[PDB]
Design a protein. Structure first.
Lengths: 56, 98, 121, 14, 46, 347, 139, 98, 64, 91, 459, 52, 57, 318, 63
């Protein structure tokens, strides 16, 4: 009866998918604002070995 | 003055048709599942879990950090004889008065 | 008024050849997605007005709505970006051409400046 | 009871 | 069911075809235009 | 009226407006106005009623006076400059006369008295043409001559139009008269920004045209000319009255609906020019328009007015004619606010 | 515009008679304009009726202007503060009281005092701060 | 400006005032419309002849072409008004209000 | 129902601006406002005067 | 619905109608003075605290000592048994 | 912030495409989950706000309000289930969509970085509220109440819009960060005085201020239960948040301009609580109580001191919860007896004891029994006012006494005395109603344990 | 909204009669041809504001 | 007597809402004169033209 | 049909022939008009529309089967016969619903005539419906305000449509009609008073017959003469009504009429005029309930052709 | 995440918004100056084209 269950209760996937999409879009926005990733006068450090970004 | 239906009597008590109404609907099954949904996702999930999550939320407010810095500064300034709190927030030399 | 009398403006031209120098609007632009959303809403409202099933009937009609809205919105966004770029270019050119009207100002540190204090008592 | 709805008098007012 | 035949009745296969074709042409034209514009921007701005 | 003749008359109206918006010679612009009047008059009388004839006569008299004043202004500008080109007008008296004539054509107060009467007289479709298309030509002419326009006269006319449009609508239970007074108020809003920035006037005109198109098409679909006839609509076509409520809220200017953006941008441009008192008064006076919009909404959709027994007959049938552009007009009239920065296209 | 110039040229708080006269003239002009519009839109039954209506409106407006200017300039002199908007507020409330008296209604008088005084104080504030009711297009 | 221009502008102003002040008849107002058109024709003709604007000597003719069109429209309306009310009186155009 | 309506709804329709109504409204509406304005303004001005004169004790008043 | 309180009665017919509306005797019925306070039609019932009314009598509302249909004092909430009391004092 | 916004948007298609039986269940589940997601925002760096993107940011002020909104939506759904049972499926879905749109607009208001976007959405909140009041109200006065609410708010807001545009033209940006960092002081000029009035008056209308509060009693009495819940809990606090944000621009002129509003609020709290003493309608009593508490918050904001701001935030949250619960309690009795008159239903404690317990706790929080967050906020406001002027304590204490009096008076009249004999429709309280009261109460008592969450950024 | 269709399509619909110094039949000169020609040549491409 | 009635339900309402509503109603009655006579409002056009010529040059 | 069709050159005049002839057979209750109308329609090759009833619309819409009284009509003729003076207002509701039904039937009839060119035989019409209303008003069954509302509706609506070319009145004396009603045996019909039938005949002969005779010729027949259907058909075929509206009408008027009658809602637009008479005004709650019940009817939820319940298919592409 | 991320993002947002504020102020001043003087690309109202003039020999020499 799985077809019946999914056919009439698929709406429960929209909102959790919405949360995942929100996380993805927020990470994309974070990508956009990477100008001063490590160029501050406070948290500016030399990249530790095997690191390319401080994710800031 | 108009042909209008008689005002409906006070909405039939959900207790009459199903004594264990729980409210939330007329059909008992949706009643039970609505109450289970409400009780679980509010009390069990949001109230309990979120209360713990807030309770153990990381001190990003830097309260402990502020206390540690205060302890270090107090120890150093008392050791060196410097006054505990300087009256000037910023160094006078850098400021150029008119 | 304003940009209407810009020299070299070919009348009744939606996108001048200069605009091609600007980046095209990305097909995933949020504005274009919003245009498609408007088209989808138009399809839903058409179905509701004609008393058709709101979300299922006329899938071809809804598709045409969305396609038309997105297609027009693409050129709309391209022209919008062109006009804003033209404004910026003209502004910078005028600023360069009239240095006196836009003089560089001496910068001072806050220590140098004096700003009066108003106590909140 | 039930939500009030405009009667003849209220409707005639407009 | 209805005494009189439904006005739309059987799907207007001509109309459906025209709508689908117009939509598809619109999308294809848009995609080609986007590609051309990307190429032109990269060319003119290096 | 034979449909071929009706199409020819409508095309003549549109061709007159196109000549107005296309010609660089004043004589031809006046000719376009004359063609607009000549073609429009029978269109207003497509359905022959004594009210239709009265409305046509009033409109003809008003537009004829406006055209005569316009031609006198053109002649004076010719006398003092020798130029036929639509450009800066070189005589202040000619400028004032031309402004009065164009305001009378637009229905700007204190030349507003004919708009409610003509709109009530003519049918809903003729009203749509009158309140949407006819506004295009005089507004185009004013935009072309905006620099010569004395800001004081235009601003006074705009403020008076807003005030009178707000006031008149409160007292009206006839849908067409309500629409006419709303048109007067929005014309005042558009002409307010004319001295400052014409693109804002164009944007307001487009938004107003979409909203009025949607409202008139909804009224035609509901076949209601009075508040009660519209109140009966909830029993038959609830979707229509719901969309009417949304469009009314947009016309009031409520955020986030599309009706907010023209007012917002107009206030912005006026403030940039240090006009602060005038935008404030205009925005506050828009509340009267908002009020009678809300009263119409209460009558139509938010509250369920009594129906009649014979409506059960209309339930069985369905609407025969479909207005294709109505859904898109509703969507544009209500949900285009997130897309204002595209106001640089008409720029 | 000449009448407005006459009212403006007189320094505030000086030559109270001349200021009152200029305000009376401004009120008379506004009353005549309102009378003409009323006669046009609402026709009078007789020429004498039209004259009576015109005189009533013009005298009401002239009295309002005269009281406003008289009271405002007197208050400016006595208080010896020329630029204070409160003088204009007092003048406006006095004009509103005169409007109520001519209309023989207390509520009209009180509402007119409040609104007209607020508007008069606003006008004085605009004079002081350079507010522009109509701004030349500068963009 | 010579005095003839003053006279013709005065004639247009007088005709305009007459049009704006109806008395009873619509035909008198339509007469004022035609009269204003005459003033405009005379003014335009004088300007064009004095300035030797050869290519504008047709503008007075087009003005009159549309003057007669407007007159014809006015009469075509006046006949219908008379049919519906029995007179050309302006006071009968009262059904539409505000 | 009559009691509730008379206590809530019927008041304004059966109200007339009269000298008693107007005077009592003026008094009990604005008079207290001006009285508190006077009291608090005088107090605040006295405090500010003492502060400017340096004649006020705030030795440990560090939490405002 | 005439049941709702109306304006201040000015004619004897108005007074009689009001008295019948408030289910009071016409002679007993006495509307508040029309001084613009807003009372209007409502009657000036005696300012007797509900304590004073005889407890022993069977009241439709025992706790309030009030019967159904009886006109309700304008300030009844003030003169409830739990609030301001006007019962006679020995001194 | 899209982690909250996008699921909230997706609530609309889920509600529209859900089966007629499952609309309430699905809405409640997913709204509660959205609130659980929103709980993450409470973690705020002390020095700086959480700047998620250009458009959206959160601080220790916005986060409690967002959590309150996200928590409030499921509570509104539970409360509104009962009286909307008879409604058709389309109408119920429309009601739910109005609620969801309101929550979305409120979230975007509290998180917006730009004052003009804040204004756009803060005015956008009117449309769903107006539709709710005027379409699902149960009295003929709903139309008048909606008109009053809409026109008061708009008359306040339009000058704010003009002033915000003028600020954009002068300073160059309306982003709150830039405004805070540059924040040049104002001068005491009539133009600046009127700019101050324009900025302040919209929020002073939203926060019911004495003389501008007339819309609130009509709206709250005439609205359905859910609409009353949002109006009491969040829509008033919209004004408080706006005033706290906007006070940065008007630094010096606040001292001169506060006295009219300060005195109006300080006297109005006493007046409104005295009105509460003599109200004949329970909903009206709660509305005037809200007016008094909001007047306290107005005083705290106008004083512009750190303790005042902390107390203002605490009072905002605590009052929102208390007023929402009180409206729910009154609505239960209204559904049972179909009248809002306080005297009609009496002695309900014998009939409904657990509801009586809920009433007791709600009133105790309303009268600010310690250590309730209500008392924390009120006490901080009182101490700030005392530092502002020692004479404020007289008015503040009088207001506290009257609040206690009217709260316990409502409790005594409704829940004590002999039961009304003729009323026979009182039935055992449903598990939904008790669950709603508990969902109101338990968060409020819990927030006392960790008060730094609702003490605002200045903590 | 002056859509300069004449300039776009190169059509001289009405610009021939716009000025008195334009070409006229049999080259009949205007009474103020010289002054008008000078004024136009001065005010060409400098904009109306400068030209004033 | 004062707080519930004389202020809230009477005087504040009379001051802000009711007086403004009444004024707008009176102006609406004035503007919507419901006369609509060509002779009447065309005279207003003449008056407006004369006034505009005088004031705005 | 549409403006496009007229432009394409569709002309109603060309299609209309001698067969085109709106014939209305009118008479008092149980006058045998139906038999003669059916016979005339058979012999002259013209469409025969049975007399419009309460559920005429139900027959012309959807399945065709009559709907429930609450959903369609909310009136009972049997109730009128048993309780003519009921406080429910059933009398005027019935009369107004019958007038609307006859308006729809006349529109449908005209549409058939214009679309096919075939004449239509109607049993009574909107022009004759006022007879029953006048009889009710004379007997006191309905108020004066009901009569005024009916007059307003008729004045607004009936003017648009063209009156019939031939009016056939079958006259049967009232006492013989009472005998016929007794013989038929319908229990409710037996209660009809003699005065009501007499007022029907009075309204007919005094008002409807002269008013129709002004426009065209009226063929008045007795019961025996009406039985000879062929003679009546011959008389109709030899009628020459040169005077009247139909000769005056041209292609333009026919196009306007063709458009009006095609839009049934436009035909019934003014039957719902907002005059709040107690008899015909339906309260908001009852109106909403009845509209919901009508919506729940099979095949009525959506526009025809889109109701999946009654077996419509391909909705996604329709 | 670490406080550094929010630190840097606030820095970047602050820069972008400050640049936008300065640019808006500059645009207002530029529009004002161009509208006042007419010496820039904006606010160039049309003037008569000199191409229309006919320079061919006329009927009379003194032209």
């Amino acid at each position: 009866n799985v077809l019946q269950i999914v056919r009439d209760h698929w709406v429960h996937i929209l909102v959790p998918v919405g949360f995942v999409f929100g996380c993805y879009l927020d990470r994309r926005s974070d990508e956009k604002l990477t100008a001063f990733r490590n160029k501050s006068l406070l948290f500016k450090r030399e990249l530790r070995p095997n690191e390319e970004v401080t994710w800031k | 003055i108009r042909l209008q239906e008689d005002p409906d009597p006070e909405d039939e008590n959900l207790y009459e048709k199903n004594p264990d109404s729980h409210g939330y609907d007329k059909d008992p099954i949706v009643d039970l599942w609505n109450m289970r949904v409400v009780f679980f996702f509010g009390f069990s999930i949001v109230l309990v879990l979120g209360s713990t999550f807030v309770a153990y939320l990381p001190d990003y407010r830097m309260q402990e950090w502020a206390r540690r810095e205060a302890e270090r500064l107090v120890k150093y300034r008392e050791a060196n004889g410097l006054p505990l709190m300087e009256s000037n927030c910023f160094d006078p030399n850098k400021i150029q008065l008119p | 008024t304003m940009m209407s009398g810009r020299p070299g403006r070919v009348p009744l031209q939606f996108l001048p050849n200069e605009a091609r120098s600007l980046p095209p609007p990305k097909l995933t632009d949020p504005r274009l997605v919003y245009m498609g959303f408007l088209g989808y809403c138009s399809g839903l409202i058409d179905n509701a007005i004609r008393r058709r099933p709101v979300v299922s009937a006329g899938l071809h009609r809804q598709l045409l709505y969305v396609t038309s809205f997105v297609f027009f919105g693409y050129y709309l966004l391209k022209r919008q970006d062109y006009m804003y770029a033209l404004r910026d270019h003209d502004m910078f050119a005028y600023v360069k051409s009239h240095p006196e009207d836009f003089p560089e100002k001496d910068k001072k540190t806050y220590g140098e400046i004096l700003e009066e204090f108003h106590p909140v008592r | 009871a039930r939500q009030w709805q405009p009667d003849v008098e209220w409707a005639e007012q407009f | 069911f209805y005494i009189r035949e439904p006005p739309h009745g059987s799907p207007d296969w001509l109309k459906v075809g025209l709508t689908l074709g117009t939509s598809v042409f619109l999308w294809i034209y848009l995609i080609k235009q986007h590609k051309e514009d990307v190429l032109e921007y990269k060319r003119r701005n290096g | 009226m034979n449909p071929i003749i009706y199409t020819t008359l409508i095309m003549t109206v549109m061709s007159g407006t196109m000549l107005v918006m296309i010609s660089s010679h004043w004589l031809l612009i006046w000719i376009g106005f004359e063609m607009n009047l000549l073609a429009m008059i029978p269109v207003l009388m497509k359905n022959f009623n004594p009210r239709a004839t009265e409305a046509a006569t009033k409109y003809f008299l008003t537009q004829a006076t406006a055209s005569m004043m316009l031609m006198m202004a053109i002649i004076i500008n010719l006398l003092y400059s020798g130029q036929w080109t639509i450009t800066k007008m070189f005589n202040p008296v000619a400028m004032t006369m031309m402004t009065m004539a164009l305001a009378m054509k637009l229905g700007l107060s204190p030349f507003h008295f004919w708009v409610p009467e003509v709109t009530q007289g003519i049918s809903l479709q003729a009203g749509l043409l009158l309140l949407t298309w006819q506004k295009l030509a005089p507004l185009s002419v004013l935009c072309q001559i905006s620099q010569s326009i004395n800001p004081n006269l235009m601003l006074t006319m705009a403020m008076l139009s807003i005030l009178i449009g707000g006031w008149g609508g409160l007292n009206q239970t006839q849908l067409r008269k309500i629409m006419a007074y709303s048109s007067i108020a929005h014309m005042g809003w558009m002409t307010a920004v004319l001295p400052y920035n014409t693109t804002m006037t164009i944007l307001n005109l487009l938004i107003y045209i979409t909203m009025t198109l949607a409202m008139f098409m909804l009224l035609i679909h509901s076949s209601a000319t009075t508040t009660l006839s519209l109140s009966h609509t909830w029993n038959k076509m609830p979707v229509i009255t719901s969309l009417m409520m949304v469009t009314l809220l947009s016309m009031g200017g409520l955020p986030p609906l599309s009706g907010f953006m023209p007012k917002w941008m107009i206030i912005q441009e006026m403030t940039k020019n240090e006009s602060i008192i005038m935008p404030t008064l205009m925005a506050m006076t828009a509340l009267l328009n908002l009020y009678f919009y809300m009263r119409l909404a209460y009558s139509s959709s938010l509250t369920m007015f009594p129906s009649t027994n014979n409506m059960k007959m209309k339930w069985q049938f369905e609407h025969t004619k479909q207005m294709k552009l109505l859904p898109t007009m509703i969507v544009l009239s209500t949900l285009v606010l997130p897309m204002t920065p595209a106001l640089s296209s008409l720029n | 515009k000449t009448l407005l110039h006459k009212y403006s040229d007189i320094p505030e708080g000086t030559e109270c008679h001349r200021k009152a006269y200029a305000s009376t003239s401004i009120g008379g002009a506004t009353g005549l304009i309102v009378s003409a519009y009323s006669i046009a839109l609402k026709p009078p039954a007789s020429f004498l009726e039209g004259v009576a209506r015109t005189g009533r409106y013009t005298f009401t407006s002239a009295a309002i202007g005269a009281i406003f200017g008289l009271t405002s300039c007197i208050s400016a002199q006595v208080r010896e503060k020329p630029d204070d908007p409160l003088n204009y507020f007092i003048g406006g409330c006095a004009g509103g009281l005169t409007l109520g008296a001519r209309t023989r209604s207390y509520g009209i008088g009180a509402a007119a005092c409040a609104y007209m005084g607020l508007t008069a104080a606003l006008v004085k504030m605009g004079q002081l701060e350079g507010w522009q009711v109509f701004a030349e297009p500068k963009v | 400006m010579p005095l003839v221009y003053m006279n013709i502008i005065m004639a247009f102003a007088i005709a305009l005032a007459g049009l704006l002040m109806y008395r009873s008849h619509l035909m008198s107002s339509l007469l004022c419309l035609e009269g204003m058109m005459l003033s405009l024709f005379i003014m335009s003709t004088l300007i064009i002849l004095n300035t030797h604007f050869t290519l504008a000597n047709m503008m007075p003719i087009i003005l009159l072409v549309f003057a007669a069109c407007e007159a014809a429209l006015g009469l075509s309306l006046l006949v219908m008004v008379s049919n519906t009310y029995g007179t050309d009186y302006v006071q009968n155009l009262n059904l539409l209000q505000c | 129902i009559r009691w509730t309506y008379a206590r809530s709804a019927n008041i304004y329709p059966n109200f007339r601006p009269t000298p008693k109504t107007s005077l009592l409204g003026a008094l009990f509406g604005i008079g207290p406002l001006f009285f508190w304005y006077y009291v608090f303004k005088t107090d605040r001005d006295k405090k500010e005067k003492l502060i400017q004169e340096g004649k006020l004790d705030q030795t440990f008043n560090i939490s405002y | 619905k005439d049941m709702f309180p109306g304006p201040y009665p000015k004619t004897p017919e108005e007074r009689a109608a009001a008295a019948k509306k408030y289910n009071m005797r016409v002679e007993d019925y006495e509307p508040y003075p029309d001084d613009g306070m807003g009372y209007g039609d409502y009657p000036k019932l005696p300012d007797r605290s509900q304590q004073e009314r005889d407890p022993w009598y069977d009241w439709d509302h025992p706790d309030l000592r009030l019967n159904w249909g009886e006109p309700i004092h304008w300030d009844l909430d003030m003169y409830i048994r739990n609030r301001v009391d006007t019962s006679p004092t020995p001194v | 912030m899209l982690k909250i916004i996008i699921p909230t948007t997706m609530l609309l298609p889920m509600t529209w495409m859900s089966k007629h039986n499952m609309i309430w269940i699905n809405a409640t589940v997913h709204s509660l989950l959205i609130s659980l997601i929103s709980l993450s925002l409470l973690n705020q760096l002390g020095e700086n706000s959480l700047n998620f993107s250009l458009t959206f940011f959160s601080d220790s002020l916005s986060a409690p309000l967002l959590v309150l909104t996200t928590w409030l939506l499921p509570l509104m759904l539970m409360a509104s289930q009962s009286h909307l049972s008879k409604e058709t499926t389309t109408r119920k879905k429309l009601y739910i969509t109005m609620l969801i749109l309101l929550q979305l607009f409120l979230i975007m208001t509290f998180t917006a970085t730009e004052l003009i976007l804040f204004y756009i959405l803060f005015e956008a909140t009117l449309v769903p509220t107006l539709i709710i009041i005027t379409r699902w109200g149960n009295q003929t006065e709903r139309l008048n109440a909606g008109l009053y609410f809409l026109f008061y708010t708009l008359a306040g807001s339009l000058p704010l819009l003009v002033a915000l545009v003028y600020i954009q033209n002068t300073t160059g940006s309306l982003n709150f960060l830039i405004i805070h960092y540059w924040s040049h002081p104002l001068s005491n000029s009539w133009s600046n005085i009127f700019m101050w009035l324009a900025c302040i008056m919209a929020f002073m209308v939203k926060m019911p201020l004495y003389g501008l509060h007339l819309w609130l009693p009509k709206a709250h009495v005439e609205a359905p239960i859910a609409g009353s819940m949002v109006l009491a809990a969040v829509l008033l606090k919209l004004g408080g948040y706006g005033m706290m944000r906007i006070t940065t621009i008007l630094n010096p002129l606040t001292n001169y301009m506060a006295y009219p509003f300060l005195m109006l609020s300080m006297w109005g709290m006493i007046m409104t609580s005295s009105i509460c003493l003599r109200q004949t309608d329970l909903k009206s009593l709660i509305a005037y109580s809200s007016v008094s508490h909001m007047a306290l918050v107005i005083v705290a904001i106008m004083i512009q001191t750190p303790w005042s701001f902390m107390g203002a935030t605490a009072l905002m949250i605590a009052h929102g919860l208390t007023s929402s619960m009180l409206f729910c309690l009154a609505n239960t009795n209204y559904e049972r007896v179909h009248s809002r008159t306080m005297i009609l239903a009496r002695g309900l404690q014998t009939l409904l004891p657990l509801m009586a317990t809920w009433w007791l706790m709600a009133s105790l929080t309303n009268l600010a029994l310690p250590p309730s967050i209500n008392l924390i906020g009120e006490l901080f406001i009182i101490t700030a006012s005392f530092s502002w002027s020692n004479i404020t304590i007289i008015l503040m204490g009088m207001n506290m006494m009257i609040t206690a009096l009217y709260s316990l008076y409502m409790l005594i009249t409704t829940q004590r005395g002999k039961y009304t004999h003729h009323i026979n429709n009182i039935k055992a309280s449903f598990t939904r109603e008790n669950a709603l009261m508990a969902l109101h109460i338990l968060p409020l008592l819990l927030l006392t344990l960790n008060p730094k969450m609702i003490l605002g950024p200045l903590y | 909204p002056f859509f300069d269709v004449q300039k776009r399509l190169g059509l001289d619909l009405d610009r021939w009669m716009t000025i008195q110094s334009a070409e006229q039949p049999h080259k009949i000169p205007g009474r103020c041809h010289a002054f008008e020609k000078e004024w136009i040549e001065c005010a060409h491409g400098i904009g109306g504001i400068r030209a004033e | 007597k004062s707080a519930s009635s004389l202020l809230d339900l009477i005087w504040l309402e009379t001051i802000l809402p009711k007086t403004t509503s009444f004024i707008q109603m009176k102006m609406s009655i004035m503007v919507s004169n419901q006369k609509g006579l060509i002779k009447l409002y065309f005279l207003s056009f003449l008056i407006t033209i004369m006034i505009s010529m005088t004031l705005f040059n | 049909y549409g403006p496009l069709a007229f432009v394409l050159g569709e002309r109603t005049t060309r299609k209309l022939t001698e067969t085109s002839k709106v014939i209305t057979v009118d008479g008092n209750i149980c006058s045998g008009k139906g038999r003669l109308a059916r016979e005339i329609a058979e012999k002259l090759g013209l469409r025969h529309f049975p007399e419009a009833g309460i559920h005429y619309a139900d027959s012309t819409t959807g399945d065709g089967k009559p709907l429930d009284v609450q959903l369609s009509g909310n009136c009972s003729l049997e109730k009128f016969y048993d309780d003519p003076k009921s406080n429910d207002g059933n009398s005027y509701r019935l009369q107004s619903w019958l007038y609307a039904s006859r308006l729809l039937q006349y529109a449908d009839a005209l549409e058939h005539l214009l679309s096919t060119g075939q004449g239509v035989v109607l049993e009574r019409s909107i022009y004759s419906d006022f007879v029953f209303l006048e009889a009710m008003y004379r007997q006191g069954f309905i108020r004066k305000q009901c009569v005024e509302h009916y007059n307003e509706v008729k004045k607004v609506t009936a003017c648009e449509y063209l009156p019939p070319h031939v009016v056939v009145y079958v006259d049967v004396p009232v006492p013989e009609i009472q005998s016929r009603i007794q013989k038929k045996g319908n229990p409710h019909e037996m209660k009809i008073t003699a005065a009501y039938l007499q007022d029907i005949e009075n309204a007919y002969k005094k008002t409807f017959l002269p008013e129709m005779s002004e426009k065209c010729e009226v063929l008045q027949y007795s019961a025996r003469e009406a039985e000879d259907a062929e003679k009546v058909v011959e008389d109709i075929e030899y009628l020459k009504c040169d005077k009247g509206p139909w000769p005056d009408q041209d292609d333009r008027t026919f196009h306007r009429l063709r458009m009006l009658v095609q839009n049934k809602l436009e035909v019934l637009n003014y039957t719902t005029i907002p005059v709040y008479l107690p008899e015909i005004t339906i309260g908001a709650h009852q109106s909403d309930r009845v509209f919901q019940k009508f919506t729940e009817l099979p095949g009525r939820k959506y526009s025809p052709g889109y109701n999946e319940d009654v077996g419509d298919k391909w909705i996604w592409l329709k | 995440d670490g406080p550094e991320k929010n630190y840097e993002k606030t820095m970047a947002i602050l820069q972008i918004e400050a640049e936008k504020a300065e640019l808006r102020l500059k645009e207002l001043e530029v529009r004002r100056l161009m509208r006042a003087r007419g010496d820039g690309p904006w606010y160039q109202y049309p003037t008569i084209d000199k191409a229309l003039i006919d320079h061919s020999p006329k009927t009379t020499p003194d032209n």
